[PDB]
Design a protein around this ligand. Structure first.
Ligand SMILES: NS(=O)(=O)c1c(F)c(F)c(N[C@]23C[C@H]4C[C@H](C[C@H](C4)C2)C3)c(F)c1F
Ligand SMILES: [Zn+2]
Length: 257
């Protein structure tokens, strides 16, 4: 039922998922000026050398590129984190126009898109158990602006025509997610939630300060995807972002400056 239109969009979610109005919801605006520098935060450790991509799926809200998370193959650790978190999937949120699309904002600025690399805490044994814990997930957010092409994203953009409608999937092996990372790993971090229903408050958010650049043609291709299934009327998959939620009683920490 939930989605991103007039009648079922983010402002409606709280009726099915009352946690929508809770104490640690995501995304948020990152006020760069009041984020607290913390010299005790560690560098983020991104170990994606052994990543195994498997498949790409249109799930009706975004597309996910999924990874084999049955061993420690692509993990995030360090940064603000105490455990090891295995990469299970990545996906993006984007706009109908280049002026919007990101979920997090930086001093109210919206980016054309936002990449989410979703990871789960190995201590809880799998993803479904991890989302029930307050430290279950670590999601690495990376902003996308439009400019030069990101060569490392092109394999993804090139397969989207094969998964146009909700429910379609395609084999997607040997995709290297290191080709989506900007140069710097400087980050902000705060405690928050999944940004889609069920909106579970299980996420340590780690948002990179440095955006990656993607070409207008790349992001144009995201916008050719569909929310609807193959049988049905065409609703373009655009503006699948939740806007910024109240920070409430939370402090955003910065690994830098
Ligand atoms: N935007 S996000 O990074 O906060 C995010 C996830 F982290 C996610 F893990 C997911 N995936 C799930 C898969 C399934 C279990 C939960 C709830 C639903 C169904 C969405 C998480 C998701 F859709 C999502 F948008
Ligand atoms: Zn997301």
């Amino acid at each position: 039922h939930w989605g991103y239109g007039k009648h079922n969009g983010p402002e409606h979610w709280h009726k099915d998922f009352p946690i929508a109005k809770g104490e640690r919801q995501s995304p948020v605006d990152i006020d760069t000026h009041t984020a607290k520098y913390d010299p005790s935060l560690k560098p983020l450790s991104v170990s994606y050398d052994q990543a195994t991509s498997l498949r790409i799926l249109n799930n009706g809200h975004a597309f996910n590129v999924e990874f084999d998370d049955s061993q420690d193959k692509a993990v995030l650790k360090g940064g603000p984190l105490d455990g090891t978190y295995r990469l299970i999937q990545f996906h993006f949120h984007w706009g109908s126009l280049d002026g919007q699309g990101s979920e997090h904002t930086v001093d109210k600025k919206k980016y054309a898109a936002e990449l989410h690399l979703v990871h789960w805490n190995t201590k809880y044994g799998d993803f479904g158990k991890a989302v029930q814990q307050p430290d279950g997930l670590a999601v690495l957010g990376i902003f996308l602006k439009v400019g030069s092409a990101k060569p490392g994203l092109q394999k993804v953009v090139d397969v989207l025509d094969s998964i146009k409608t909700k429910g379609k999937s395609a084999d997607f092996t040997n995709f290297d997610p290191r080709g989506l990372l900007p140069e710097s790993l400087d980050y902000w971090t705060y405690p928050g939630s999944l940004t889609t229903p069920p909106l579970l408050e299980c996420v340590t958010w780690i948002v990179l300060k440095e955006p990656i650049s993607v070409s207008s043609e790349q992001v144009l291709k995201f916008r050719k995807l569909n929310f609807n299934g193959e049988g049905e009327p065409e609703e373009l998959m655009v503006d699948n972002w939740r806007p910024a939620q109240p920070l409430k009683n939370r402090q955003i920490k910065a690994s830098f400056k």
